[PDB]
Amino acid sequence: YEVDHADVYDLFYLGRGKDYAAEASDIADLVRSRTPEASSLLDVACGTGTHLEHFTKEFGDTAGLELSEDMLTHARKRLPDATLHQGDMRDFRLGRKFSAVVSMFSSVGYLKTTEELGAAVASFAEHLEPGGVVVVEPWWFPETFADGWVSADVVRRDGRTVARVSHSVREGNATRMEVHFTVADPGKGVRHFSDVHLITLFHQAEYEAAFTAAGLRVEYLEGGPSGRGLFVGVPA
Amino acid sequence: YEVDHADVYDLFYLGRGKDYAAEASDIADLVRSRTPEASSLLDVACGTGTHLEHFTKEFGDTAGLELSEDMLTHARKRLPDATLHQGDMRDFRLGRKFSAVVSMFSSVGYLKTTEELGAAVASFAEHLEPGGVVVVEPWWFPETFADGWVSADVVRRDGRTVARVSHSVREGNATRMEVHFTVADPGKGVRHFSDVHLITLFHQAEYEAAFTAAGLRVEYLEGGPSGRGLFVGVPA
Ligand SMILES: O=c1ccn([C@@H]2O[C@H](COP(=O)(O)OP(=O)(O)Oc3ccccc3)[C@@H](O)[C@H]2O)c(=O)[nH]1
Ligand SMILES: O=c1ccn([C@@H]2O[C@H](COP(=O)(O)OP(=O)(O)Oc3ccccc3)[C@@H](O)[C@H]2O)c(=O)[nH]1
Ligand SMILES: C[S@@+](CC[C@H](N)C(=O)[O-])C[C@H]1O[C@@H](n2cnc3c(N)ncnc32)[C@H](O)[C@@H]1O
Ligand SMILES: C[S@@+](CC[C@H](N)C(=O)[O-])C[C@H]1O[C@@H](n2cnc3c(N)ncnc32)[C@H](O)[C@@H]1O
């Protein structure tokens, strides 16, 4: 019995209560707060495009960047008319600029070293219009990481039930999170799958340094959509 | 990081709220309602011995029978002084009698035909003292089986998390249940495993014929510890 992973991740976070719409909206205001005339936005590592959908309604002129083809395929299925690009946040070149460049849900954490973070932040800066703003939702900091953390949840949405458990342990300067998904569709079957994610624990200062090197004045905001806060940058 | 499967089931059921003490307690009084001076009890397919430990304070002279050596190693670890037997409820011969012979938690559902169910029941009968009573907690009947059923729960006990998902579908005259367990211990690791169970859907009438053939006058009691009811039989 087969199941589509990304579709499974999508149903889970929706059922979990993650609210992409509300998230998208708060970010748009955040964006407007620094760039009132904001008129275009780029979602780096947009995944399946849930925030992109809403950002598209907010600013109209939007685009998405994703390293994963599979993420891309799902994004396209959700947004057949969206402008999407395959590429690495590390060094992409889109040949255009945007009022805002944002990266949500800790994607930059998948960057392996400060040199990569810096390069990815520089790239963000490079697609930024004058008076633009960069918003990055980071992964946890070495100082705020909760080692050995276990998450276990059950969601049931649209007739499907999904159980998910993750265990997180620090390894080096990264979080090694192993996730187990259990999926069941009544009268159809039950299926299990797991993923292992390595998310870098950059110190906040490392994050800020990446913004400074890219010529961006940056500020960290506590809280954020997931409790990891948010980094906001603008041309220095 | 490895996990002891039966200890997993155990912790699971405790966490879920299955009250083996209360159940044994209820069965103990059910027995007495039929055999007031009941003084010995055999627990057939005792599993890891949870009910047996309680029946032991209930009647003192007790014994357990299990076909599974694994189940027996855990019952023994739990009760170093319990009298335990390895063997088949279809045809074991203990060379002794008990005031009560009980089989809990749908164990007889693992028998595949009415012929086996009859041989098992005759065996219980053959181990019964005069004025004794047999109590069988059956599996669901074809008439009350809920096909496509999905069960999904998360329990947390002794700092260990266990997420369990089962999906049940009818197959011929049995339920095929595939059970998925996901277990984690913070800072220890996370593990997943799955089992598949084929439990016969015997009609109520079929359970009765078994008792009848065994020389016992039987009564079906609605509800029971698992909502599957209970069969109470005494020498006709
Ligand atoms: O104060 C905290 C609380 C949680 N965590 C970490 O947050 C994660 C929560 O596990 P999760 O599976 O519920 O998080 P998630 O659904 O957000 O998974 C991810 C992983 C990477 C990027 C986005 C979502 C774990 O790594 C845990 O160590 C911390 O580091 N600090
Ligand atoms: O009205 C009902 C309600 C439940 N069921 C069946 O009860 C079972 C409940 O799933 P479960 O995983 O919660 O059962 P369990 O934890 O009691 O697992 C077993 C399985 C065999 C023996 C003992 C416990 C499923 O097969 C479901 O079809 C029915 O047939 N009819
Ligand atoms: C936690 S998901 C976030 C997806 C989306 N932002 C969301 O909110 O759901 C991390 C995403 O980053 C993408 N990703 C990882 N490394 C990347 C890189 N170097 N360049 C671009 N995208 C990357 C992954 O493919 C994945 O879709
Ligand atoms: C659902 S478990 C319940 C066990 C226990 N009475 C309880 O309440 O936890 C069913 C048990 O039946 C045992 N079993 C299955 N077939 C058997 C047989 N033919 N003879 C004896 N035991 C059997 C299995 O080893 C398993 O431990």
Curated annotation (Swiss-Prot), chains A, B:
It catalyses: dTDP-3-amino-3,4,6-trideoxy-alpha-D-glucose + 2 S-adenosyl-L-methionine = dTDP-alpha-D-desosamine + 2 S-adenosyl-L-homocysteine + 2 H(+). It is an enzyme of class 2 (transferase). S-adenosyl-L-methionine binds at Y20, A45, E66, D88, M89, M104. Substrate binds at Y13, R16, T144, F145, A146, S151, R164, V165, S166, H167, S168, R228. InterPro entries: Methyltransf_25 (IPR041698), SAM-dependent_MTases_sf (IPR029063). SUPFAM superfamilies: S-adenosyl-L-methionine-dependent methyltransferases (SSF53335). One of its GO terms (biological process) is antibiotic biosynthetic process. GO terms for molecular function: protein homodimerization activity; S-adenosylmethionine-dependent methyltransferase activity. The keyword Methyltransferase applies. CDD domains: AdoMet_MTases. Pathway: Antibiotic biosynthesis. Keywords: Antibiotic biosynthesis, Methyltransferase, S-adenosyl-L-methionine, Transferase. Its EC number is 2.1.1.234. It comes from the Bacteria. Homodimer. Belongs to the methyltransferase TylM1/DesVI family. S-adenosyl-L-methionine-dependent methyltransferase involved in the biosynthesis of desosamine, found in certain macrolide antibiotics such as erthyromycin, azithromycin, clarithromycin, and methymycin. Catalyzes the last step in the biosynthesis of dTDP-desosamine, i.e. the N,N-dimethylation of the 3-amino group of dTDP-3-amino-3,4,6-trideoxy-alpha-D-glucose. This is dTDP-3-amino-3,4,6-trideoxy-alpha-D-glucopyranose N,N-dimethyltransferase.
